[PDB]
Write a structure and sequence with these properties.
Largest sheet of chain A: 4 strands, mixed
Number of helices of chain A: 2
Assembly: trimeric
Distance between the termini of chain A: 13 Å
Structural class of chain A: alpha/beta
Chains A, B, C: 4-oxalocrotonate tautomerase
Oligomer: homotrimer
Strand content of chain A: 25-35%
Order of helices and strands of chain A: EHEEEEHEEE
PDB class: isomerase
Entry title: F6 fused 4-OT wild type asymmetric trimer
Number of domains of chain A: 1
Largest interface: A-B, 33 and 34 residues
Helix content of chain A: 25-40%
Keywords: asymmetric, fused, 4-oxalocrotonate tautomerase, isomerase
Chain lengths: 123, 123, 123
């Protein structure tokens, strides 16, 4: 899994480490991917760059994009959305209703692992 | 400028074409990029893939990620957020208050046009 | 390294496999990343969803987003832009000038692998 988390600037190094740990645990629990396969990028944006309702505010965030190889069930995706959202709301003290999760499914012919396709490798 | 737009499935083809036209016009107006440099990429998400507050709902959308070569002024970015937000709200009949726009600046050493860096091309 | 490649629909399965092989090789060559560390996410978009200059056309693509842990030099990033762009142009028979690359350097405190930060892991 590849998760991108859009965040304002200013969260401490320890909070970012705790968020990476917790979002990885939530991904393993929800969809069962091996922990080693979970990559997370936290994308901090400056205040000048973050819009909600046409005006600048950090309250537009957090937004999480989760990119998965195709084939996860509806139930797995529902669990991923719930657990990623609960985790970021707790770790960053963000209101649950301000958290967004968007999943992209990548067909196994369209996903490369080490220069070979996921379908070539049996995924 | 390269805009990734996250939207639900089911908008008519002509509404998507109107969105591509309008977001291009808004980008030209707001930051003065030539229209021929504006790429609009619409990613439609199925309802199984969209979360707000940890729950499945299309109300999480729309979200626009605007990828720019670094260097726009704060005022230009503010105008881009305002005009893109107004445009997508109008074209999709979506609430302005539900619309998020995030700008990501790419340093000119990190942006490629035709295999050359934006820096080498004087941008 | 994690590459997200936006593409029109219609490229054959073998061409997508060849593209995964070639972009992985370019990444090994340009920046010294072991092949097994390179993940590629091809995101196909329908023709109704892709705009350049405000109108629909596959000429808006390909766009490659290359997510790297921060640390590569400007020289290495310039090489990566050149080689990724030449590779996708050749494999997909796309004009070189239509290729776009956006490198997203992620600070090592802000990137996670297996639940640990890149900095914790020595990256």
């Amino acid at each position: 899994p590849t998760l991108e988390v859009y965040l304002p600037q200013g969260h401490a190094v320890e909070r970012k480490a705790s968020l990476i740990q917790g979002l990885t645990q939530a991904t393993v629990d929800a969809i069962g991917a091996p922990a080693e396969s979970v990559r997370i990028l936290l994308s901090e944006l400056p205040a000048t760059n973050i819009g909600l309702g046409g005006t600048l505010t950090p309250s537009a965030l957090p937004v999480i994009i989760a990119i998965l190889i195709a084939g996860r069930t509806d139930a797995q995706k529902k669990a991923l959305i719930a657990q990623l959202s609960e985790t970021i709301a707790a770790v960053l003290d963000a209101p649950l209703q301000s958290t967004r999760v968007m999943i992209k499914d990548i067909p196994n012919t369209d996903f490369g692992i080490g220069g070979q396709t996921a379908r070539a490798l049996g995924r």
